[PDB]
């Protein structure tokens, strides 16, 4: 679990690749690749959330 | 990977337990338990984000 992710985590930092790319790069299920995105605040929170246009 | 999560995912829905509880319940590493939280929008986005107090 942590072994493949350690090498995969570095790849994420280098390009912030999507979980689909990391999954194929290490042939790991989306759960492992998706979790790396969950730890990456930049790829996880993509704006949206709120910040409406104010009333 | 998906087998334990399937049973663990149901437990998450029942109580929205934190990844620490699910990890101990199925004795799985934080990566597997943390990913379930990543899929749960209610436990993932806990307000914050933005929504400042306006100027
Ligand atoms: Zn990223
Ligand atoms: Zn939840």
From Swiss-Prot, chains A, B:
It comes from the Viruses. A zinc finger (Integrase-type) spans 3-44. Zn(2+) binds at residues 12, 16, 40, 43. It is found in: Virion; Host nucleus; Host cytoplasm. Homotetramer; may further associate as a homohexadecamer. Part of the pre-integration complex (PIC) which is composed of viral genome, matrix protein, Vpr and integrase. Interacts with human SMARCB1/INI1 and human PSIP1/LEDGF isoform 1. Interacts with human KPNA3; this interaction might play a role in nuclear import of the pre-integration complex. Interacts with human NUP153; this interaction might play a role in nuclear import of the pre-integration complex. Catalyzes viral DNA integration into the host chromosome, by performing a series of DNA cutting and joining reactions. This enzyme activity takes place after virion entry into a cell and reverse transcription of the RNA genome in dsDNA. The first step in the integration process is 3' processing. This step requires a complex comprising the viral genome, matrix protein, Vpr and integrase. This complex is called the pre-integration complex (PIC). The integrase protein removes 2 nucleotides from each 3' end of the viral DNA, leaving recessed CA OH's at the 3' ends. The core domain contains the D-x(n)-D-x(35)-E motif, named for the phylogenetically conserved glutamic acid and aspartic acid residues and the invariant 35 amino acid spacing between the second and third acidic residues. Each acidic residue of the D,D(35)E motif is independently essential for the 3'-processing and strand transfer activities of purified integrase protein. This is Integrase. The gene is gag-pol.
């Amino acid at each position: 679990f942590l072994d493949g992710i350690d090498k995969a985590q570095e790849e994420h930092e280098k390009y912030h690749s999507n979980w689909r790319a990391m999954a194929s790069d290490f042939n790991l299920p989306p759960v492992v690749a998706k979790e790396i995105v969950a730890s990456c605040d930049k790829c996880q929170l993509k704006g949206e959330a709120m910040h409406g246009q104010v009333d």
